[PDB]
């Protein structure tokens, strides 16, 4: 009996900001106007980036009142941690009481507790808060994650798969709370990386139930997980860095990314499908992390996908943007929805076999083998 | 067949402090000699602390060369970072080829990494950094935690059961490296819970392999793990906590922590044990994590314990002062090593079953039952 997903739940900040009016923002709270010919740059990058809106806590109030976090570097990490700690419980209480409403059990019925966070360093931490918060059993057993990256989506669904087989009964709640404070700072004309994070990273947390043996009277699976797998991309040293300083989380990314993941990517799939007979990537239903739609077109190009193969992928870019860890499961959400409005079989667009790919800091790539599940 | 305990390696900087001369090193390279009652607090810490030396990354050197780090609140974290990365990595390292060197299986055998750091945030973090100095295979399956704190000993081993027993032939390999630059600092009147970090924490690395179904022509299990559980102490919200800021890891205990620890061990005991019919406390070895010497002491006061019970916990401490997540290995390597040299039955101090304690941030208590192996 395979880890199964059971329910999901998501949250974002309230402001919402929509990219055709980011790069006015951007320069404008961040005193970079009189960099004429960076903000052109960064409005191309805005406008190409296939991201329509993004929700982020950030505001031009939180920036007036710390002018060194606008800065592309000044001390400021005690400023960002304080509304880290805050927004990544608050967002995950919001998405984790989503899932548990869709799960349909009492929350006294989580045995563990699973909580990724790209930033936000405490001690106790975030699972903590959480268990606080949710009122769950004192005694659920944890697991707190912090500065892992987008790639995590997978690293927790790795980790729930075995919790949940090898202990009867094991309900485990995951959720993973991005928020974007601890790395929004200006732009740099020596550091055109660091650039890139602020036209692709939004604010979004997740949450979902996993658990084995699933009681069909109550609960309802909406994918199993079937196999997992963590590689580290060869000649990839160095390729996505970040690093927590005194002025927040930095962040650096060379431009052979999309390069080295997308030539790899057909090798995580022969060893994930390889076992299972399965040659055709077209017959499968991808959830992948869109790090980028650069990222998104040379998958789709090397591996030989339909155009319409990531097509949940790129609305969830487009509608949110990168949420880091947190997106693949509003890509999961958003597929299982998809599929039902348009009368499909099964909750992965009628497709029996899926897979989902979690992309980050290495390169490392998750690579988690999913089924679908029957839908009425 | 459940998960099992086939190695452990350790290491530790090469800098040692006996705890005996640390009141005035430390007075005189934080510029405080002339705060005459805060030096009597520290060394009465020191003193009463039950440690006689620790291996730390600090030296003078370090410490004239980086006034902000001697500093009780200097912006600092830039720098500490640097060391802290460096340092964990290589003491890592050096625990992790002991470890493998016991276990007897090539490295390449090795399906899954699991690294925990107190500090030294890193994206990729120390679990990259180890998979490429190990040069273990690129498809590792990794987790890597960061800032857990002194409870972590027992997570890493829960997470490491549940691994090893669904995953047919998974071997993993554990590494608990813990360095202290990222908190040390000069004292502060306003702040006196502050100095007991630099009276009691050590830095050191642990390293274990853990598998399920030995093979027992090559591979020696050493301890099996029964079963795990955590939990929040009642009404201790706050008693531990830690921040990291601009001027690196603070450090806050209460002190209440000694006796909500104590008082509510029992339970702990109780939770785990009942469901295995036992009751005497004093039939199991204990391997517990010496956060302090009062914690140690009320235990085995309240809980009924011999007073040797704690014998090789207290040692530890002893030797090594308080490693955090890694201390509680550096007492399951020294009790099976004394086992052996007492001429005892198993791994256990000849006895059958055992418990292993973290306490940590929550305040957080993980017990793990452990079950001895033939000596």
Redesign the interface.
Known sequence: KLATVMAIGTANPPNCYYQADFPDFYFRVTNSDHLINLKQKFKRLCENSRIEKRYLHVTEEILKENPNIAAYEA?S??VR?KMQVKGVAELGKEAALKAIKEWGQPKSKITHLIVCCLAG?????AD?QL?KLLDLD????????????CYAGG?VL??A???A???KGARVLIVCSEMTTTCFRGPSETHLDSMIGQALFGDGAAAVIVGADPDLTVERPIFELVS?????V?ESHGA???????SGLSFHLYKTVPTLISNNIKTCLS?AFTPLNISDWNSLFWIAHPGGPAILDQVTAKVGLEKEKLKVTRQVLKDYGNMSSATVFFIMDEMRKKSLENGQATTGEGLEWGVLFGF???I?VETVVLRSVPVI
């Open positions: 001390t990490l005690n941690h360093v405490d001690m106790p931490g903590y268990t004192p005694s659920v057993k944890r697991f707190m994650f912090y500065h892992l990256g690293t790795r980790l798969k075995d919790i087989e090898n202990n997992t797998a963590q590689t580290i060869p996505i860095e970040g690093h927590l300083l005194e060893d980050g800091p290495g490392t």
